[PDB]
Enzyme design. Structure first.
Site, mmCIF file in Angstrom:
data_model
loop_
_atom_site.group_PDB
_atom_site.id
_atom_site.type_symbol
_atom_site.label_atom_id
_atom_site.label_comp_id
_atom_site.label_asym_id
_atom_site.label_seq_id
_atom_site.Cartn_x
_atom_site.Cartn_y
_atom_site.Cartn_z
ATOM 1 C CE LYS C 259 -4.262 -1.195 1.518
ATOM 2 N NZ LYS C 259 -5.091 -1.415 0.757
ATOM 3 N NE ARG C 333 -10.383 -7.775 -4.229
ATOM 4 C CZ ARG C 333 -10.737 -7.840 -3.182
ATOM 5 N NH1 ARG C 333 -9.386 -8.681 -1.824
ATOM 6 N NH2 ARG C 333 -10.713 -6.471 -2.547
#
Ligand SMILES: [Zn+2]
Ligand SMILES: [Zn+2]
Ligand SMILES: [Zn+2]
Ligand SMILES: [Zn+2]
Ligand SMILES: [Zn+2]
Ligand SMILES: [Zn+2]
Lengths: 481, 240, 481
Positions: C259, C333
Site C-alpha cells: 500500500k 477476496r
C-alpha cells in the site's frame, strides 16, 4: 436588538469579570453571575457561553473566556499572549452573535480596546460576495465611551487585513491586474488626499527595460500593469520614502512548468504579496502616519500558451543581468527582480518586499510565522518587535552566500532562476533576490506558508488569511514615531 | 550534561517504505549517535573537567511480518501513548524513550541530535543545522560555539502552534506525524517537547547537514560528520 | 445534575413542541417558550439552543430542532426522514450536554423513542480508550415511562453499532485476530446462553483445506483464527441458520503489493466486515430473536515478509479451485473464498457476507450507501426495506457475467484474483466471490466506502463508523417475524 459580548478571566472564589462584565452584573442585580454559576464549567480561554433575556436591550449576552488576567509577553512564543487571548475570545463571542442573526453587537474592550476591535472585525469577516447565500453582516461597536481611539485604531488595523483577505480570496478572473490596481487606487484615494497612484501600462513597462517581468507576462492574454502607489505623509516632501514591493501574480498556473491540478485554485492568492503591502499602505494613510511610503506591485498572470516563457530561456533584467529561466514556475523571482531594481530609483530609507514565493517556506515554518531574510539586524529587530504586538509572527531565515553559490550556476546566464539542488529552496530564492539589491536595509518576507487559514489562528475563518498585514502597519506606526 | 542521539543504523521506512532512489544514504540515519558519541570521545581526549553522559538507542527500521503497522499505538517510558501513523517517523519514537531516560541523570543540560527530517533539508539545506530549544541561554552558547567552528547552527521555532498539530488525540495522547504536511521539522520537534520537562533542552536536526557534495570546501564529497566540532567547542567553553 | 434534551418542530403562530416540551413549558409557567422566543431565530432541523436555570433539576435544557412533524419516508432518498431527523437532533442535543460535563441527560422520545435512543447513544459515543484525556461519559435515559421498550430497543441497536466502531477503531496491534475473537466471544456469551463460540486455530484451518486464507496469513507472525459464532435462538434447533461471513483482515499493509503510506493507518479497519456481522449477531442474541444464526470471520493480518504471498502465485481454495494471486492487496477476496465455501456446510437459509473490499466502492457510492451484489431480488428487497428504517442505506450493484468473464482469465488458474482491466473493480471483485457460492440467496456487501465518518451522517463523530450494523439487525428482526 443588540447582543453584548462580555469577558471573564480564568480562576479565589470567583473568576473575575472585566469592569464591563462586573458593571453589567450589578445592572442585572447579580443575575449574570448567578446563571454563569448554575450553567456549567468555568469558561477557559476562547470559550464562550450565551445567556438570553437578562436585560431588555441585550436579549443575547455572550460571556467569553479571556484566560489569565496576568498574561503578557511570552518569551518562548514571541507574542503578547494577553492580546492574543482578547482577539481570540472576542471573535468567538461576536461569531455567536452573528449565528443568531443579530445585526449589532456591543463589545467589551477587555482591558485592550485595540485587540478587542481586531478580534471583532477579524472574527466577523466573510467573503460571501458571489454567493446568493450571504451571512448577516453585524456591526461591532465599542461597549462604552472611554477608549474610542484605541477601539478605532484596532478597527483600522483589522480592516487593512480584511482588505487583503478579500483581495486574495477573489477569483483570479475577477481580480485581474487592472481590476486589482483599480480597487487599490480607489481605497487609497479614500484614505488620504496625500496619495498618487500610477497604473502603468505595458508601454511604460517596456520603456523601463523590465525584461524579466515582461517575459512572465507575455504568455497570458491579460494585459500586465505596474502599480506605483505613493503616500506622501511626511512634512518634509523630500524625506526619503520606505518602499514596499509585492509580488502580484494574479493567477499562477506554473506556465510550461505547469502546476499539478490538485488545489491549484489557491494560486489566485499568488498576488498575496501585493495585497499585503498595498493594504498596509492604505492603512498607513488612514492612520495619517507622518512618513513617505511608495508601494510597487508588478501585476500579471503566469499562463501556458504558444508565447509563454520556455524552460532554459535567458531574459534580461532592468539592471542588465541575464537570468536563466530554468523553471517557469519560479516566476515571482523574475518579476521581483525588475521591481526591486526600480525600487532603488526612489532613494529609499528601507526596501521591504513580500511574496508568496515558495512552498519551501511552508514546509519550513508552515504558518507558525512568516519568514524573513534580511541583510540588516536593525530591520529584523523592528519587524520582530512589531509582530510581538500583533501576534502575527515573523521568524528570521538565513542569507548565507552558501545559497547564493547554488544560484550563481553560470551555464548560460549570470544567475539561474532556481537553485542547483532542491534543498533550501526558500533560502536560494531569497539569495536570488539579493542579486538585485544593493541597499543596506532590505527585508524579504516569504508569505507562502501564512497564505491560508484553516484552524491555526482562531480569530480568522478558514480561507485566505491576509497575513502579515498588521505586522507591517505596526512596523510603519512605530517607525513614524 | 547529557547528549542523546538517534541511532537508526539503517532506515528503510518500515511498512511506510522509503522510495528506492538514494535509499543507501539511510545508513547515515545514525548520524545523531555518531555526532554526540564523537564529541564525547573528543571531550575525554581533551580532558575537559565535566561530567558527560551519552545515550544512543541503536536499531534498524525494517519491513517484516512483525514490523510496526501504521495506526498502532505504542507506550513510551513515561506512559504516554503514541499513535504511529507513519512508520518512517521512527526516530521520533526512539528518542521519546531515550529523552525520558535522560531525566534520570538529573542533568544540567539535555542536547539531542538526529537526522530527523527531510523537512530540515528543504528548510536550511546544509547551510546550517537547525536547533529547537526552550532556552535562549542554550541557543546563545551553541550559536557562539558555531561562530568559531564555521559549522553553523540556525534557531528554528518551538511554538505551541506545531504542538496542537501533533496533539491530534484520535487513539493516542500524541501522534507520531503532524496533522498537515507543513512545518514537518517544527512538528517533529514539538513531538519531542512532549517528552522533556527539563528547562534547558536543545534538539538539533542534522538531516540537511548529513552529506557534503561541494558546499564546505575542506570536506570531500561524502557523509560529512556535522556538527561535531560545534558540540566539542560548546563543551570546551562550558568546561571553562 | 441532569440536563434535559427537548425537541420542537419547524414552523401557525408557534412552531410546536413535542408533548414533553409542551409539558415542560407548562411546568415552568410559560418560561421556556418565552425565552425561546426572545432568544433568536426558530431552530431548524439538527439545530440546538441551550437555556440555563429554568428549573432546579434541569440547570441545562437544550431545545432541538426536529424538522417537519409530518416527515415520513422519502421516495427519492430512500429512508424514513423523520427518524433521521430525530437521531440527528437528539445527538446534537446530547453532545451539548456532554460539552458542559453534565453526567446524565433525560431525553425526550420525540415521537419515536427508538430513534431518540439511537441518536443519544450514537451521538455520545467516543473511543478515547488509550488517551489520558477522556471525555465525560454521560448517561442518556428516556424522559418519562411510556415507551421504555422502544427506548431500550434503540439503545440495543445503537450499542451494536458502537461495538463495531470500537472494534474497527482500535489499533491493529491491540486488535489482533485472537484479541478480536476474545472480545466477540465475551460479548456474545453475555448476550445469551444460547451461544457457542469456536476460536479455531491454524491447525484446524489447515485440516479444513483453507488454502487461500492460509496463504494470506502466512506472511505475518501473528497467528490467524477462524471464528465460528453460533446463536441458536430458534425453537426448532434444526431450523436452517442464516450465515453471516465477514472479512477480518486486522491490518492490511497490501503485502508485497504494498500500500502507499498515505493514510495506511485506516487499514486497521479492514476487519470492518467481521466487526459488522459479529456485532449484529451480539445484538440479535440480546434481542432474543427466535432464529438460528451462524457467524464466520476469518481473522488474519496481511504483511510483507520473506514468506508472504508473491504476485503470480496460485493457491488452492477449499472447493479445489485454483486462484492466481496477481496482486497481494486483493487478499480479502482470497480469505472470503474459503469462508464462503465453509458457509455451505451449514445448509443455510441465507448467506450474507460483508467486507471493506474495494476502494472502487468508495469511488462509486462514497458513503452515501453500502453496495450490495445479490443473486436474489427477495434478499435485495428485505435489505433495502431494512435500510429505509435505519437510515443506513444500501444500493444494489450488478452481478453481470460481464464482470465474471474479466476474472475467468485462465493463464495459470481457474480464476484470477484481480480483474483483467481496472474498470468496475467492485463489480469484478463481487463476480470473483460468485465463483465460490452455489447458494440461490447470497448477498455481498461492500462496506469500504461507509467505513469512516467525517461529517456525512450527523449523529456520528468523525471516526470509524460501524455501518451498516443496524441494517443487518433490522433485517434479522424482520426475518424473525
Ligand atoms: Zn509560480
Ligand atoms: Zn508564483
Ligand atoms: Zn524513518
Ligand atoms: Zn529515520
Ligand atoms: Zn488488501
Ligand atoms: Zn483488504
Amino acid at each position: 436588538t443588540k447582543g453584548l459580548v462580555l469577558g471573564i478571566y480564568s480562576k479565589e472564589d470567583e473568576p473575575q469579570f472585566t469592569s464591563a462584565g462586573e458593571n453589567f452584573n450589578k445592572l442585572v442585580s447579580g443575575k449574570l453571575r448567578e446563571i454563569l454559576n448554575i450553567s456549567g464549567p468555568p469558561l477557559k480561554a476562547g470559550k464562550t457561553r450565551t445567556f438570553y433575556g437578562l436585560h431588555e436591550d441585550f436579549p443575547s449576552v455572550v460571556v467569553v473566556g479571556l484566560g489569565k488576567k496576568t498574561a503578557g509577553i511570552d518569551e518562548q512564543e514571541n507574542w503578547h499572549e494577553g492580546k492574543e487571548n482578547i482577539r481570540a475570545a472576542v471573535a468567538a463571542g461576536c461569531r455567536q452573535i452573528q449565528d443568531l442573526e443579530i445585526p449589532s453587537v456591543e463589545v467589551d474592550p477587555c482591558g485592550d480596546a485595540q485587540a478587542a476591535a481586531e478580534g471583532a472585525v477579524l472574527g466577523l469577516y466573510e467573503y460571501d460576495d458571489l454567493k446568493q447565500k450571504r451571512k448577516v453582516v453585524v456591526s461591532a461597536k465599542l461597549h462604552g465611551s472611554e477608549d474610542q481611539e484605541a477601539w478605532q485604531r484596532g478597527v483600522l488595523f483589522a480592516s487593512g487585513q480584511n482588505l487583503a483577505r478579500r483581495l486574495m480570496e477573489t477569483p483570479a478572473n475577477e481580480m485581474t491586474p487592472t481590476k486589482f490596481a483599480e480597487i487599490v487606487e480607489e481605497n487609497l484615494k479614500s484614505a488620504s488626499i496625500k496619495t498618487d497612484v500610477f497604473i502603468r501600462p505595458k508601454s511604460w513597462i517596456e520603456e523601463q527595460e523590465m525584461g524579466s517581468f515582461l517575459s512572465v507576462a507575455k504568455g497570458s492574454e491579460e494585459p500586465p500593469v505596474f502599480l506605483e502607489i505613493h503616500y506622501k505623509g511626511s512634512p518634509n516632501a523630500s524625506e526619503p520614502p520606505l518602499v514596499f514591493v509585492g509580488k502580484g501574480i494574479t493567477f499562477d498556473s506554473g506556465g510550461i512548468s505547469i502546476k499539478a491540478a490538485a488545489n491549484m485554485d489557491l494560486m489566485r492568492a499568488d498576488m498575496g504579496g501585493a495585497a499585503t503591502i498595498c493594504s498596509a499602505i492604505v492603512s498607513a494613510a488612514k492612520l495619517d502616519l507622518p512618513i513617505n511610503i511608495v508601494g510597487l506591485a508588478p501585476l500579471c498572470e503566469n499562463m501556458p500558451s504558444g508565447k509563454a516563457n520556455k524552460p532554459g530561456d535567458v531574459v534580461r533584467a532592468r539592471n542588465g543581468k541575464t537570468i536563466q529561466v530554468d523553471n517557469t514556475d519560479a516566476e515571482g523571482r523574475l518579476i521581483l527582480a525588475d521591481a526591486l531594481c526600480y525600487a532603488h530609483t526612489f532613494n529609499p530609507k528601507v526596501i521591504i518586499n513580500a511574496a508568496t514565493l515558495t512552498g519551501a517556506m511552508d514546509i519550513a515554518l508552515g504558518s507558525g510565522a512568516t519568514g524573513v531574510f534580511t541583510n540588516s539586524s536593525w530591520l529584523w529587530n523592528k519587524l520582530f518587535e512589531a509582530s510581538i504586538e500583533t501576534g502575527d509572527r515573523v521568524w528570521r531565515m538565513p542569507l548565507f552566500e552558501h545559497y547564493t553559490r547554488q544560484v550563481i550556476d553560470c551555464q548560460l546566464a549570470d544567475v539561474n532562476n532556481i537553485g542547483k539542488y532542491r534543498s533550501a529552496g526558500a533560502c536560494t530564492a531569497a539569495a536570488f533576490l539579493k542579486e538585485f539589491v544593493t541597499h543596506p536595509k532590505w527585508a524579504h518576507l516569504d508569505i507562502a506558508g501564512v497564505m491560508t487559514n484553516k484552524d491555526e489562528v482562531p480569530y480568522l475563518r478558514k480561507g485566505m488569511a491576509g497575513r502579515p498585514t498588521r505586522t507591517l502597519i505596526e512596523f510603519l506606526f512605530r517607525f513614524s514615531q
